[PDB]
């Protein structure tokens, strides 16, 4: 969103749903952002980092936010690939 000069000119950049690739508007109060914790390989304890996921309002009320979060977690390697 830049002019011929190359100054980024629009006032902000809206987050995009991690599942459907829709953009989460200013007055979309049914959207989420869920931080899933990271485990240290050997100890089994919380590191202090996490894999954050944003999801659109339409996806949630459709009822695919569950299976969407599941696929994103399974792709990031949080959930086992056998499952």
């Amino acid at each position: 969103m830049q002019s011929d000069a190359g100054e980024f000119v629009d006032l902000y950049v809206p987050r995009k749903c991690s599942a459907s690739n829709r953009i989460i508007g200013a007055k979309d109060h049914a959207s989420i952002q869920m931080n899933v914790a990271e485990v240290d390989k050997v100890t089994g304890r919380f590191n202090g980092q996490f894999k954050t996921y944003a999801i659109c309002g339409a996806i949630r009320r459709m009822g695919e936010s569950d299976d969407s979060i599941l696929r994103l977690a399974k792709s990031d390697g949080i959930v086992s690939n056998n499952f």
């Binding site: 599942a19 459907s20 695919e64 299976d67 969407s68 696929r71």
Partner: protein, 83 residues
């Protein structure tokens, strides 16, 4: 379900689907080697025959035509032919 592997369906799902509504349509029918209780010669019979298949020399009659699959007479072993 939003994400479904349309290219690689598991056999049970596309074994269930209507024979035309599969990805590559295939018949639910087959040919079967079927023999009489007395004689040694075998006869090739279609799954959904729709004629009366007489044992060669009309020694007896093998199948009977119905709505769907052809009813093979009692006391006739069969082995479905595969390629």
């Amino acid at each position: 379900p939003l994400a479904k592997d349309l290219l690689h369906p598991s056999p049970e799902e596309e074994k269930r689907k209507h024979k035309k509504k599969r990805l590559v349509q295939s018949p639910n029918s087959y040919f079967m080697d079927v023999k009489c209780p007395g004689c040694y010669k075998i006869t090739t019979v279609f799954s959904h025959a729709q004629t009366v298949v007489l044992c060669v020399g009309c020694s007896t009659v093998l199948c009977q035509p119905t709505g769907g699959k052809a009813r093979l007479t009692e006391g006739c072993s069969f082995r479905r032919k595969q390629h």
